[PDB]
From Swiss-Prot:
Protein name: DNA-binding transcriptional repressor YiaJ
Induction behaviour: Expression of yiaJ is autogenously regulated and reduced by the binding of CRP-cAMP to the CRP site 1 of the YiaK-S promoter.
Gene behind this protein: yiaJ
Purpose: Negatively controls the transcription of the yiaKLMNOPQRS operon, which may be involved in the utilization of 2,3-diketo-L-gulonate.
MF-aspect GO terms: DNA binding; DNA-binding transcription factor activity
BP GO terms, sorted: negative regulation of DNA-templated transcription
UniProt keyword annotation of Transit peptide present: no
Limits of the IclR-ED domain: 4-176
Length: 181
């Protein structure tokens, strides 16, 4: 994670300053996302309980859904079979049914973006994007967390633009090869 954080940190800090919001950066470790880097909000007021080293389940993490969306569909079926106990309705919005998840994953795979639409806690939303390697695999992902209230005010696409530009820069720099670096 050292090498990737060195590449990514200036870009993640920049996005943190530009949006004022929580910036999350994860890697995939099979059936969970690992939060390897996190910046707390500056002017943003929503602070999540997420922390560096946290393991985030794929089904309820926006970044985790990105990993599944760019993976094989057999993964999702076997994941549902083998994680029956772990897949739980955290809110009324959590995606707990396989058909619903496939529908969601198709949209993410097509658009290259995911949201957490209050699937972990009401009032908390996230927007996430993939960081591609040279082969179009997705080893890492970036997300912005903020209040659902604020997200409705500013708009997903409005925030998605700098978020994606941030991921693109990281991906481009990784391909070629900060205080928090």
């Amino acid at each position: 994670s050292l090498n990737i954080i060195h590449i990514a940190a200036p870009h993640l800090e920049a996005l943190n300053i530009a949006t004022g919001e929580t910036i999350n950066f994860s890697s995939r470790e099979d059936d969970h996302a690992i939060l390897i880097y996190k910046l707390e909000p500056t002017t943003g007021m929503l602070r999540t309980r997420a922390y560096i080293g946290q393991h985030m389940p794929l089904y309820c993490s926006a970044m985790g859904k990105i990993y599944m969306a760019f993976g094989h569909p057999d993964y999702v079926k076997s994941y549902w079979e083998s994680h029956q106990h772990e897949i739980q309705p955290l809110t009324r919005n959590t995606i707990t049914e396989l058909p619903a998840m496939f529908d969601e994953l198709a949209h993410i795979r097509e658009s290259g973006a995911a949201m957490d639409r209050e699937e972990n806690e009401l009032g908390v939303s996230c927007i996430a994007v993939p960081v591609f390697d040279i082969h179009g695999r997705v080893p890492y992902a970036v997300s912005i967390s903020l209040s659902t209230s604020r997200l409705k005010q500013v708009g997903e696409k409005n925030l998605l633009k700098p978020l994606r530009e941030t991921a693109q820069a990281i991906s481009n720099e990784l391909g070629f090869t900060a205080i928090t670096g």
